[PDB]
Assembly symmetry: D3
Homo-oligomer: 160 residues x 6
Amino acid sequence: TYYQDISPSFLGFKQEKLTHIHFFLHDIVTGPKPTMIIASESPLNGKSESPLPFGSIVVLEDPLTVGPELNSELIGKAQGFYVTVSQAAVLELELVMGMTFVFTGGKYNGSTLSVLGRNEIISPIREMPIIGGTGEFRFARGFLQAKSAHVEYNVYVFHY
Amino acid sequence: ATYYQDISPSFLGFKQEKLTHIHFFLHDIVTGPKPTMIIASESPLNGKSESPLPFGSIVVLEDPLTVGPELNSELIGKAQGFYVTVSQAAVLELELVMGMTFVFTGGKYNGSTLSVLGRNEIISPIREMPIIGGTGEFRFARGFLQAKSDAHVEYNVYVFHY
Amino acid sequence: NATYYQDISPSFLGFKQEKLTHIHFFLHDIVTGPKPTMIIASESPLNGKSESPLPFGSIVVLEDPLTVGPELNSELIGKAQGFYVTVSQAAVLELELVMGMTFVFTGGKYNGSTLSVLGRNEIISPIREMPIIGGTGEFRFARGFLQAKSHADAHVEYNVYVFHY
Amino acid sequence: TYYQDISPSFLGFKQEKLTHIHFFLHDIVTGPKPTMIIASESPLNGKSESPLPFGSIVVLEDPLTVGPELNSELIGKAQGFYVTVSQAAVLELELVMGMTFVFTGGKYNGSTLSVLGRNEIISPIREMPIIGGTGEFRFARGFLQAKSHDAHVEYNVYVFHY
Amino acid sequence: NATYYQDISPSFLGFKQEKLTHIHFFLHDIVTGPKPTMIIASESPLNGKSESPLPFGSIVVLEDPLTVGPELNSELIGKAQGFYVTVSQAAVLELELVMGMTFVFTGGKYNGSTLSVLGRNEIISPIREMPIIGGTGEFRFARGFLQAKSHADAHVEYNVYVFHY
Amino acid sequence: FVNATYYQDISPSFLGFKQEKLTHIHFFLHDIVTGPKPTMIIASESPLNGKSESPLPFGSIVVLEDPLTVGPELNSELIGKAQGFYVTVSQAAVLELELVMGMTFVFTGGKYNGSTLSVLGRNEIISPIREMPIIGGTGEFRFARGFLQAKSHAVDYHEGDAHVEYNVYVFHY
């Protein structure tokens, strides 16, 4: 009535904001042309029983949609690579992942987040850290959470 | 086309600081049946000076705070405190050091207070003074206050708190 | 579990970590004896007109001892000095105060340190809160608040919560 | 020289700066117009072997100069009041001060600082908190240290601000 | 005017204040000659099939000089070491890279310190912004971003802004 | 002892704040190359393989699931595993490899079970002290900033086996 909480930008301060981003990643392995490929197959290709033996390198350019249907509203790509890092895994596989997200659509059109984290696919919820970012996401500090082709993503990141 | 939302840091356990604009009118009633201030102790050179408040006078006050400049508007709080005349020249362009607190009555900040110790020359249009601290919703306050001018002053208060 | 992790002070990397300190003491107000700790410093001009023991516009000066416990015998660890002003024109017995006082501790870690306070004191309130407006000593750069507890020659329980370095 | 340290405002951040202010406060009692008057002596004047009994109130307008000589460059004035909070003894007076510093001349022209704290005049060094400030000292969190050298006390002021 | 004031560093009172620094150097990617600065550590499986020189899934590993000025003969600042991968299925000339690399600095105050980087990179875009993911040495707790500028062998202009202590 | 009792210094969580902590972590990384059950693989050979004189030629790519123990013995209490990759990145180097690594420590045991840190940095294996940044974390280690410091306890520079000791300093909430 006689008071309002305003933005520190009024007095010229650059407060940090917390931003929750939601989207779906589609790693597509079957199709006329898919989205990820084996950049270098694992030396134990012949011996392991795993479809992706220890030490496979995969690179990927997965689209990011607003909802779980593939033809949902595109908002960005996830580009980068993962690497198979569980010697014992056969199907329940474990990955280290180095991907960046690039967004197109809205405030964050052009802004990118970077990730490097450990993803053990069998887990219901999988947590990797938001390493940093560009554009609006400069000075990013945060994490993400992937549930599970198409994976639900929940990103929380501090920036300005 | 909205895959994002700027959530509050409280969602993750953090307690970010906030900036609040407070706006209200202060009523120094000097004449009438019960006035709002009184001269708790007078300057030992009262008759000598042509000033109504010779250097070294001490007024105590209790001025109501209203949403609008009419005294009848919604009363949101009150200023209590004192001030000291601090210019020797003086006469009518008085200079005061004021120590005073604001209490509020209703709203988010029902019951919270703000304290201020500062300096104003009444003759100037903008007078700035600091928010030295606060209680309640205004714990840990740090900010400033801008006053615009039997009397009614316009107050703009910018506070950081949590 | 043998343990391979411990939390350390940010001191070890040269940072000056902000600490929150909880200070607990009793403030005795001796109105008896040949040396009272308080005094009306400037009575109100409406002294005779009003029925209050301390009418609108009175000014009190105080020099009160601070002890670790509620008995005066307990360790003297400080002293509050300052002043306050009655700021209710209505009040007869339900006084409203503005206080400008500073706590100087003579005690342990904080011997020589001070906290300053300017705030409001409704004397009907069972728990009254005032803000820590700044400090010196270990209490340099202090931000915080303060809570005084007492119902209506006595004493008063202080709990202080003050961030500093 | 392939690298250089830049201020955070290049990226639009409002970084906090630590400022050291040096000046001399002049405490004039002798002469045709001094700088402090006794606004209210205590009800224990004669009953006290003391020039300022417990409970005296003094109001002050003191000039702040660059050097120790009243003639040196004038940069501001201290205004406010202080209250004698020590009983008996005397010469060993202890005072709680509420004053503000208003600065002329400089990048801090028209800016103020506020102080409320405890002055044991005996002490060689006396420390007091900077409780808030205005102008360029909005949100000031700091302290000052006064060194006891008519009088002229050396002040050294250490203020965080934006 | 005789100035009565001065700004100090907060370390005068013990604090370890954030610092923001600009670093400006040139990175040279010699892809041609007797000794280049990178090699194709793992060729992409779709070599014959793709038209681009560096097909999706290629891994390059680099150890590139950093100079203060754009001539390779310029004063040497440090190394950029690391890897990148081509992350665009359709690109033929307008490639897209996810890059992972470090900068060792042998120069002045920052001798021995490192910064890390992991981000996107559109080779043909004029301004290429990548995050500073962290750092060692003086750049512990590094936080920032970096901008690379080139044109439609090589040398690329680098401007990095980093917060640290 | 005495006059010491009226002040107590407490967690700013008592007032709802989430103060950042500084955590020191100490473990031993075990780099097993030779023998029947090793923790490494050369996911891709350097094209320099035949020509170069280094055991791990420039442009090799390794992938590792190294174990983390509290003490120097491999028999010691297992506290985590390090997983990821690195690339050889010095062309002059023969024995004194230069590595760029990207890797994650997942911890099993105690306060930090399931929490990860992630690391991307240079390490110059011959240095007596190798510093590498902590680039982010998860679980209890969300919003992590910090750095490692690895020191070689035992090491064979021809066969590649190592017992490295790590000391990580990380800030978080």
